[PDB]
Design a binder for these strands. Structure first.
Ligand SMILES: [Mn+2]
Ligand SMILES: [Mn+2]
Ligand SMILES: [Mn+2]
Ligand SMILES: [Mn+2]
Ligand SMILES: [Mn+2]
Ligand SMILES: [Mn+2]
Ligand SMILES: [Mn+2]
Ligand SMILES: [Mn+2]
Ligand SMILES: [Mn+2]
Ligand SMILES: [Mn+2]
Ligand SMILES: [Mn+2]
Lengths: 244, 244
RNA sequence: UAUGCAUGCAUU
RNA sequence: UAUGCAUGCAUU
């Protein structure tokens, strides 16, 4: 665990950058009934080596929409600087994702994604500023947080009531809202596919509304994990595997 | 692949040893409705290090009917011959025989009354698969259990075969594998109610096919019978506990 | 045999 | 995040 000085610096940085988050739609395709104008959807992920605390592999992919085919992949081995601490995920993974976005601008600027799906929460976060917000503010790209487990903050809990609501999700696209003790809607549970029971937890990262974020996440789901995140996960793990 | 002159020598050896296979019951517990008298069921497997020489050969003995492991011998070995379909014994069997001999020296009262082998017996290009080969070299009763169909003597995994598999509806259901010669070479077996891919069971030595199938079914907590499953799990764990 | 993917359970 | 197991499909 990092020293308190590091964690203090981290909390202060999250509070500083949180003032820049935009939690409403700012792109014309977002207000379109079929997302007309949306052509490129990004996904990011970092995979790790079981033996090694230093080496990781970061991946950025860009997919065509609505076809969901990979038109760009950049995967690179990186040197880890921070350990994993819940609530501070960005300080472990986000510096490498920002660099991949910058490399894309240098290499294939016409494939810059119009929105990025991030493997982690956005505003559903201990301090309202998860990795998806953090990437969005540092890149100014619209970003969606997609998490596979419920971050138990603001009274949210994976209890019997929560599991009851999960059973009530019956088809792909069904949802229920994640309400905090303050009464605010932090995100949505989403049944991403007809043949999956475990929901995704979707929240706003940056420059998108929750309703649009949920609907786009659903439209990217060939399987349970949305295809951009899924392809970034698959390809970064393949890189680690082929270099053992 | 070994040269054809080598494979021809191996075929000749398989033909000579086949004269020693006994494909009927020779143990009093075998004809018993509940296998009363059966206390010890063996299982063998060889796992490999993803390096072509090093492997881990495992012998387990399980109590019956509780299916609890009362003996495990997992041994790193230097494997020499490559896998050639129809010649599996020339890769794995010398090391399995050595494990049985080690058991006799170490815990002779735990010698198994029957061994389940991860591979075919008489269901085989020349009617003499690895399970027959282990049985004849140890004189132990042996059952061959394969996880996919060896396509010999007109047997094929075609649509007709797949339709018969769909007719297997409950755990214990079987259908016979009839060769073009008119012989019943083995049985397809549905291991349990929640599995659809069958096991392919055949006589190794000193057991009838009907008894071999019924005992295989009694060892199935999951799709793979518990003696083979434990040998597979524990030999893989042994490899990880060193190299993995 | 080893690996990949899908779906779920557990551990972390 | 990584690992184990379960069930299926695929490559070999
Ligand atoms: Mn379009
Ligand atoms: Mn991730
Ligand atoms: Mn991942
Ligand atoms: Mn690759
Ligand atoms: Mn008994
Ligand atoms: Mn095997
Ligand atoms: Mn095995
Ligand atoms: Mn295996
Ligand atoms: Mn999984
Ligand atoms: Mn993972
Ligand atoms: Mn499997």
């Amino acid at each position: 665990r990092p020293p308190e000085e590091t964690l203090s610096l981290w909390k202060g940085e999250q509070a500083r950058l949180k003032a820049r988050v935009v939690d409403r739609d700012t792109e014309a395709w977002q207000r379109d009934p079929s997302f007309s104008g949306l052509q490129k959807v990004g996904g990011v992920d970092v995979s790790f080596v079981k033996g090694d605390s230093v080496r990781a592999c970061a991946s950025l992919v860009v997919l065509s929409y609505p076809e969901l085919k990979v038109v760009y992949e950049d995967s690179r081995m990186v040197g880890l600087k921070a350990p994993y601490v819940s609530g501070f995920l960005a300080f472990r993974e986000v510096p490498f994702l920002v660099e991949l976005v910058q490399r894309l601008q240098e290499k294939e600027p016409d494939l810059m994604p119009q929105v990025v799906l991030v493997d982690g929460n956005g505003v559903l976060h201990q301090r309202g500023f998860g990795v998806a917000c953090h990437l969005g503010v540092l890149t100014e790209l619209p970003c969606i947080g997609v998490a596979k487990k419920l971050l138990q903050v603001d009274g949210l809990e994976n209890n019997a009531l929560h599991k009851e609501k999960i059973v009530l999700l019956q088809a792909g696209g069904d949802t229920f809202p994640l309400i905090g003790s303050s009464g605010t809607v932090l995100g949505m549970a989403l049944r991403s596919h007809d043949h999956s029971t475990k929901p995704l937890y979707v929240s706003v990262g940056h420059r998108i509304s929750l309703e649009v974020a949920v609907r786009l996440t659903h439209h990217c789901c060939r399987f349970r994990i949305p295809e951009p995140i899924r392809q970034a996960d698959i390809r970064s793990r393949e890189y680690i595997r082929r270099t053992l």
